[PDB]
Amino acid sequence: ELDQLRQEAEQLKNQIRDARKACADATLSQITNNIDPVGRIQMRTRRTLRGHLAKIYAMHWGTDSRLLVSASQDGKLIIWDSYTTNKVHAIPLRSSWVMTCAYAPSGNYVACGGLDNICSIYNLKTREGNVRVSRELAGHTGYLSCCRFLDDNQIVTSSGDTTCALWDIETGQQTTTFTGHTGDVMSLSLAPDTRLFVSGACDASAKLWDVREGMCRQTFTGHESDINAICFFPNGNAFATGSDDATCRLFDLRADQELMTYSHDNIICGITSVSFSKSGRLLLAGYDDFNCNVWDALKADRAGVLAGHDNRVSCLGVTDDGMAVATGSWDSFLKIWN
Amino acid sequence: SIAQARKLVEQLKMEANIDRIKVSKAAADLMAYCEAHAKEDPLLTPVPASENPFREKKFF
Amino acid sequence: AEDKAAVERSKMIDRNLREDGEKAAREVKLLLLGAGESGKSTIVKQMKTGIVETHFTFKDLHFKMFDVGAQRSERKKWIHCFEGVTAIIFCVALSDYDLVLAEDEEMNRMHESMKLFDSICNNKWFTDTSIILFLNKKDLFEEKIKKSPLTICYPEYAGSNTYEEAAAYIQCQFEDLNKRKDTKEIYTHFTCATDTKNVQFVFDAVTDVIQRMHLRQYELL
Amino acid sequence: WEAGMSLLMALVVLLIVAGNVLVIAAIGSTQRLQTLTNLFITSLACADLVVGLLVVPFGATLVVRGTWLWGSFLCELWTSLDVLCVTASIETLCVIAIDRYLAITSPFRYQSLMTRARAKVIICTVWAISALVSFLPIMMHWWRDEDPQALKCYQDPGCCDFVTNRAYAIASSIISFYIPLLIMIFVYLRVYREAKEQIRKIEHKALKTLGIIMGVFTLCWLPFFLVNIVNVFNRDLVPDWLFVFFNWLGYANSAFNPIIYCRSPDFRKAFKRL
Numbered sequence: 001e002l003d004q005l006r007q008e009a010e011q012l013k014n015q016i017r018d019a020r021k022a023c024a025d026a027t028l029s030q031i032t033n034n035i036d037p038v039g040r041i042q043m044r045t046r047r048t049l050r051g052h053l054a055k056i057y058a059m060h061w062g063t064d065s066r067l068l069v070s071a072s073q074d075g076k077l078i079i080w081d082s083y084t085t086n087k088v089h090a091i092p093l094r095s096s097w098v099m100t101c102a103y104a105p106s107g108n109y110v111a112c113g114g115l116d117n118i119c120s121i122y123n124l125k126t127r128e129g130n131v132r133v134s135r136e137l138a139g140h141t142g143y144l145s146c147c148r149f150l151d152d153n154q155i156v157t158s159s160g161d162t163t164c165a166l167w168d169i170e171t172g173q174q175t176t177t178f179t180g181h182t183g184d185v186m187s188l189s190l191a192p193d194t195r196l197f198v199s200g201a202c203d204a205s206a207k208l209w210d211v212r213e214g215m216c217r218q219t220f221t222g223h224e225s226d227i228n229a230i231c232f233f234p235n236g237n238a239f240a241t242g243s244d245d246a247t248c249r250l251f252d253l254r255a256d257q258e259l260m261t262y263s264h265d266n267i268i269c270g271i272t273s274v275s276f277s278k279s280g281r282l283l284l285a286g287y288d289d290f291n292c293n294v295w296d297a298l299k300a301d302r303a304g305v306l307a308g309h310d311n312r313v314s315c316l317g318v319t320d321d322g323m324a325v326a327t328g329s330w331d332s333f334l335k336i337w338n
Numbered sequence: 339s340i341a342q343a344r345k346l347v348e349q350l351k352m353e354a355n356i357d358r359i360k361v362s363k364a365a366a367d368l369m370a371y372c373e374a375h376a377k378e379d380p381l382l383t384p385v386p387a388s389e390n391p392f393r394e395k396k397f398f
Numbered sequence: 399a400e401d402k403a404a405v406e407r408s409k410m411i412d413r414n415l416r417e418d419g420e421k422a423a424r425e426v427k428l429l430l431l432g433a434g435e436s437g438k439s440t441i442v443k444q445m446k447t448g449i450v451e452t453h454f455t456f457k458d459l460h461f462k463m464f465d466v467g468a469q470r471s472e473r474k475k476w477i478h479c480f481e482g483v484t485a486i487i488f489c490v491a492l493s494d495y496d497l498v499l500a501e502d503e504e505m506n507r508m509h510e511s512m513k514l515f516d517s518i519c520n521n522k523w524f525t526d527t528s529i530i531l532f533l534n535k536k537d538l539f540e541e542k543i544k545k546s547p548l549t550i551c552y553p554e555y556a557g558s559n560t561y562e563e564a565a566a567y568i569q570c571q572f573e574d575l576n577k578r579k580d581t582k583e584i585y586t587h588f589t590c591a592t593d594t595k596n597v598q599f600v601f602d603a604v605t606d607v608i609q610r611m612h613l614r615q616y617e618l619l
Numbered sequence: 620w621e622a623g624m625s626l627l628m629a630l631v632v633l634l635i636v637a638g639n640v641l642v643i644a645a646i647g648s649t650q651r652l653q654t655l656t657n658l659f660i661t662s663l664a665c666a667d668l669v670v671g672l673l674v675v676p677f678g679a680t681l682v683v684r685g686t687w688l689w690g691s692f693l694c695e696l697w698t699s700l701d702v703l704c705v706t707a708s709i710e711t712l713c714v715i716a717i718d719r720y721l722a723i724t725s726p727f728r729y730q731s732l733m734t735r736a737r738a739k740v741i742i743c744t745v746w747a748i749s750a751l752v753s754f755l756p757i758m759m760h761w762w763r764d765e766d767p768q769a770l771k772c773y774q775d776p777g778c779c780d781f782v783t784n785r786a787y788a789i790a791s792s793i794i795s796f797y798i799p800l801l802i803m804i805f806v807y808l809r810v811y812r813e814a815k816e817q818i819r820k821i822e823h824k825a826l827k828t829l830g831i832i833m834g835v836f837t838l839c840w841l842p843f844f845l846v847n848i849v850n851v852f853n854r855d856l857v858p859d860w861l862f863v864f865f866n867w868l869g870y871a872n873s874a875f876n877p878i879i880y881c882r883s884p885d886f887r888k889a890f891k892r893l
């Protein structure tokens with residue numbers, strides 16, 4: 001009878017909640033009270049990349065910290081070179097719509113995905129041809145939200161069907177399928193070790209999926225609205241997540257709780273992307289209010305503000321070196337803040 | 339429905355059995371790490387103008 | 399030398415991007431956002447996985463009609479992707495006034511279509527874009543109303559059993575759902591399985607919408 | 620007397636330069652403003668800027684001093700620049716009207732044919748017509764006549780008046796004002812009928828928006844060109860102070876054009892940003 005299953009599930013949930021509550025005997029704000037402020041962080045729009053004829057929806061750097069992909073609804077995927085701000089590749093996409101991108105670490109591939117439910121993988125380094133459709137992965141049933149490169153061969157993807165997948169490019173098959181989300185997976189994030197990866201959702205929950213084993217390890221909740229972005233901590237033991245409630249939350253894996261919440265009364269619009277600095281002391285969150293806020297990591301005290309766009313800040317990224325911070329907005333202009 | 343509830347209860351039972359450390363330990367670890375790797379961060383501490391690639395640096 | 403070659407590549411790519419952008423702006427987009435059983439197949443046929451795209455020419459004009467009916471996901475997350483289409487084609491079945499959803503228990507499919515229309519029209523992303531409203535299976539609806547009354551899906555209706563009265567009533571009921579009465583317009587049209595003029599009406603509606611857009615841009619209207 | 624007109628001319632030139640440079644900077648800064656019609660708007664703004672930069676100052680100095688103090692060469696230079704700029708402004712207005720009519724009457728054909736390259740081509744053609752009708756006939760002394768009074772005025776360095784013959788006067792008039800006026804009248808009447816039909820489909824806003832655009836240009840320029848074409852037949856009919864006053868009234872169109880053709884919300888936001 002469904003009644004007994006529901007009752008034991010509720011009992012287990014209450015047990016988990018009580019355990020977590022017992023774990024949280026203090027507060028991160030209290031432990032970080034003695035820590036001093038970081039200070040105002042002034043940033044100027046050093047370089048501005050223009051050429052996209054429509055709003056930008058996603059971007060991603062490379063291990064070189066130099067090249068950076070971008071996506072636009074016009075149907076053209078650009079590969080900018082931040083140093084000289086001179087386009088190095090412009091790929092015309094089959095589908096006019098695109099909702100994500102990915103630049104593999106080795107730099108020998110690029111990805112793309114949108115409403116067409118067909119994760120395309122284009123080859124960049126070729127003998128004579130400029131760019132060719134290396135592969136097209138079509139197993140999902142909904143729009144893709146984000147794609148990341150585990151390696152030149154494997155690629156993990158999240159779709160609107162509430163199911164993540166781990167495709168093998170060479171074979172073109174769903175080597176593994178993670179399911180369990182009750183809503184759309186709007187964004188995911190790989191860890192530095194690449195063994196585990198976190199996945200947001202629209203049902204106000206995040207799940208820590210294990211790549212090799214293929215099982216959910218932990219679940220984190222606490223948001224009052226959908227999760228529109230997520231990003232690990234550079235250390236790899238905790239992860240920050242935005243939401244539509246204008247509230248960012250820094251969850252921890254080991255403790256299995258919410259360490260701290262960044263939120264201010266002034267800001268009312270939702271978040272669209274988040275990221276961490278190299279040392280992780282500053283959480284950069286690109287709000288939907290045409291601005292970007294650099295919150296302190298350990299003090300939840302805002303520090304500086306980046307406002308150079310007219311429309312909402314869509315995508316935000318930072319280089320592994322941590323030297324620059326790219327921000328792409330619907331203004332059709334990427335800004336390499338520094 | 340039946341399979342859904344069974345999978346749900348199995349996942350919850352597997353999740354409840356995990357070692358959790360007090361928030362104090364995790365907070366202290368994150369603090370120590372963010373303290374150790376603060377010098378290398380470019381955004382936090384002003385990076386030398388010469389080393390700053392975007393402003394003025396020799397490219398090739 | 400290498401810097402010169404890179405700058406030349408950049409210039410060529412920029413010229414190609416500008417040319418392709420002009421070519422795209424030349425095209426006219428349309429969104430065929432309809433219900434599940436709104437006879438959208440008949441429309442897509444008489445006009446000619448994931449998102450379907452039909453590119454067809456008429457009077458030396460290119461129409462790219464997008465169909466997202468096969469999405470079946472939370473529309474609130476990707477609807478903003480279509481901010482800028484020249485119009486929105488909305489297909490509705492006049493023969494589904496007495497039917498209910500196989501999932502729901504006592505909800506008329508007409509009421510679900512009405513709710514979807516209210517949601518898509520009063521959305522914060524389509525304040526300026528117009529709406530074309532196709533009504534399909536007109537003869538089937540005529541026969542049905544000849545058999546059964548209209549008070550099934552509307553407990554209040556001042557009118558006898560007749561085709562024209564019920565048609566006008568459904569038209570007004572669908573039209574009275576938009577709130578920006580002074581910013582957008584609804585172009586209704588009844589069609590059948592063998593109409594042979596749907597593309598012409600779509601052309602006329604698009605022409606009027608573009609004329610009104612240019613006028614409001616020049617402040618004449 | 621001169622003290623009263625000095626401040627007037629100064630304010631006029633300052634307003635002209637400010638409005639025109641502001642419009643140019645607004646169109647050049649933002650990308651959303653970089654549209655087709657905005658190209659013609661930029662051409663008009665640049666012509667009016669050249670006016671306020673070179674023509675208006677010399678004319679003001681002449682009218683306050685009462686005599687030309689620069690030289691015959693500079694007199695001819697100033698006259699040629701004035702003719703070029705006035706013709707360029709009026710022709711940019713007429714081509715803008717033609718563009719609006721083509722776009723509103725048949726949107727698809729206009730969207731297909733028109734392109735930035737062809738817009739640049741049309742602007743270059745207009746400016747070339749202006750140059751051909753302003754510099755060459757002037758430099759060749761074909762504007763001069765044989766009336767002993769005209770020769771007397773030409774030899775004297777002080778007299779930099781615009782006394783001209785019949786041929787060049789009528790020609791420049793018909794090419795710079797009258798044909799553009801007819802074109803604008805026809806195209807705008809057609810656009811008005813189209814707007815009336817459209818409103819009938821779905822109440823005096825279009826009438827006012829068109830009346831402003833047309834009547835401003837008319838009341839600004841028509842008097843001067845009427846008196847000009849009249850001076851050819853018989854000189855004694857109209858005085859000279861009235862001629863100069865109508866000339867300055869026409870110049871005022873250079874200041875009035877930007878505010879009339881840059882009133883949309885996009886331009887408002889672009890101006891508020893800067």
Ligand SMILES: CC(C)NC[C@H](O)c1ccc(O)c(O)c1
Pocket residue numbers: 697698701702705706781788791792795847866
């Ligand atoms: C006072 C003089 C120098 N200005 C001449 C006036 O601007 C003019 C311009 C164009 C013409 O075709 C014209 O007859 C007269």
